Amino acid sequence: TTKVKLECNPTARIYRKHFLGKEHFNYYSLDTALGHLVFSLKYDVIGDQEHLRLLLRTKCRTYHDVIPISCLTEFPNVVQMAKLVCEDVNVDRFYPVLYPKASRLIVTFDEHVISNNFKFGVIYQKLGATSEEELFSTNEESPAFVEFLEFLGQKVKLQDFKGFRGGLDVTHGQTGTESVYCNFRNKEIMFHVSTKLPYTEGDAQQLQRKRHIGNDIVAVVFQDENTPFVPDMIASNFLHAYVVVQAEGGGPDGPLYKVSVTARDDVPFFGPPLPDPAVFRKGPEFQEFLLTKLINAEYACYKAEKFAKLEERTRAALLETLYEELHIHSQSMMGL
């Protein structure tokens, strides 16, 4: 097994696998038209055909393109080169980055839209539920739901947990007795199961359960019958995608699971493609799929309306952070 890539923004991990730990150059300059600029370049050959991989980062976006070069003898100067991957660039000259730690500051800026840990939600839909409270108040698990939870991940005591918590309570034990968690790739996934989360008596919205699942971006929904579901049954500013999972009595060895997505017309197509039966295993086969689908699901929402707006301001701020560091540190490599 080698496995397909996680559907994070592909253009992020470029620097990582082409520039880092190999010979490149990093330059910075101040364009008053586009903002702070942090721009890398690598001269490389494939076969005997010489190319020139460029990567320029703006207050806003990050531009990539490969440019071939013959014995074109002229090496396009750094300003020309910049303009060959982004035309709106209009600067006097670029200044070279000379801080020997720079490559690590840079890789860490590009790889900030890839995340190492995930908090997902789990909800049980019983009988023929429709509203919010019908779901969020369900106590005591279905036979199928119990079987499902131990298969999906390992049970873990929260009371002295060393890994990624995801907003849950370790020390005081305020949030749930136990939970479900697993280590997927080099990624850490923590689930917020409603039934495992603490119950309040008389509470309509069930706030103690809805504080976690409500701040989740993606969540699983486990059914027993074929009771319909939409992203409107639940009211949340954060939940943008749901994975529907339903049990079957048509499996002599392992129950069959009917699986389907429920997007908001805000999120793109994502995840490993859904099989033509739309049915699944009971073993590690399906488990591996589901988690990729959820991880790819969140990465899909990153592009959606709500998060992209916030991301815009984060990116520019983190760029200024970086731009400063490469400026001051490159300067005190000679002074001035």
Resolution in angstroms comes to 3.4
Q: Are 255 and 282 a contacting pair, CB within 8 Å?
A: yes
CA distance 56 to 326: 15
CA distances from 197 to 28, 72, 210, 275 (A): 49, 66, 9, 33
Written as one string, the DSSP assignment of 242-263 is EEEEE--S--SSS---EEEEE-
The answer to whether residues 122 and 256 belong to one domain is yes
Q: Is residue 323 part of a domain?
A: yes
Q: Is residue 3 part of a domain?
A: no
The answer to whether residues 140 and 270 belong to one domain is yes
Within 13 Å, how many C-alpha atoms sit on residue 81's CB side? 26
CA distance 157 to 83: 56
The answer to whether residues 197 and 58 belong to one domain is no
Residue labelled with tokens 């470029």: 14
Q: Are 192 and 208 a contacting pair, CB within 8 Å?
A: no
In the chain, which ranges are E strands? 25-31, 35-46, 49-57, 62-68, 95-96, 117-125, 154-157, 178-183, 188-193, 218-223, 241-246, 258-262
Q: Name the residue among 180, 178, 177 with its Cα closest to residue 153.
A: 180
Q: Name the residue among 271, 317, 299, 268 with its Cα closest to residue 114.
A: 299
The answer to whether residues 297 and 282 belong to one domain is yes
List the strands of the sheet with 241-246, edge to edge: 154-157, 178-183, 188-193, 117-125, 218-223, 241-246, 258-262
The answer to whether residues 64 and 165 belong to one domain is no
The answer to whether residues 213 and 230 belong to one domain is yes
Q: Is residue 160 part of a domain?
A: yes
Please report, for the domain that includes residue 330, its CATH number.
3.30.1120.160
Range of the structural domain that residue 321 is part of: 9-113+304-336
Rounded to a whole number, what is the distance in angstroms from the first to the last CA of the chain?
54
The answer to whether residues 290 and 214 belong to one domain is yes
Please report, for the domain that includes residue 229, its CATH number.
3.40.50.11210
The answer to whether residues 290 and 179 belong to one domain is yes
Two tokens at 277?
């039966």
- How far is residue 46 CA from its own chain's centroid? 32
Q: Give me the number of domains the chain comprises.
A: 2
CA distances from 12 to 6, 96, 248 (A): 12, 22, 41
Which one-letter amino acid corresponds to residue 285? Answer: E
CA distance 302 to 6: 14
The answer to whether residues 176 and 223 belong to one domain is yes
The answer to whether residues 257 and 239 belong to one domain is yes
Q: Name the residue among 204, 217, 215, 218 with its Cα closest to residue 135.
A: 204
CA distance 302 to 54: 25
The answer to whether residues 282 and 321 belong to one domain is no
74: left (phi over 0), alpha (psi -120 to 50) or beta: beta
Q: Is residue 201 part of a domain?
A: yes
CA distances from 257 to 84, 149, 275, 289 (A): 51, 13, 12, 13
Q: Is residue 49 part of a domain?
A: yes
The answer to whether residues 99 and 118 belong to one domain is no
Q: Is residue 325 part of a domain?
A: yes
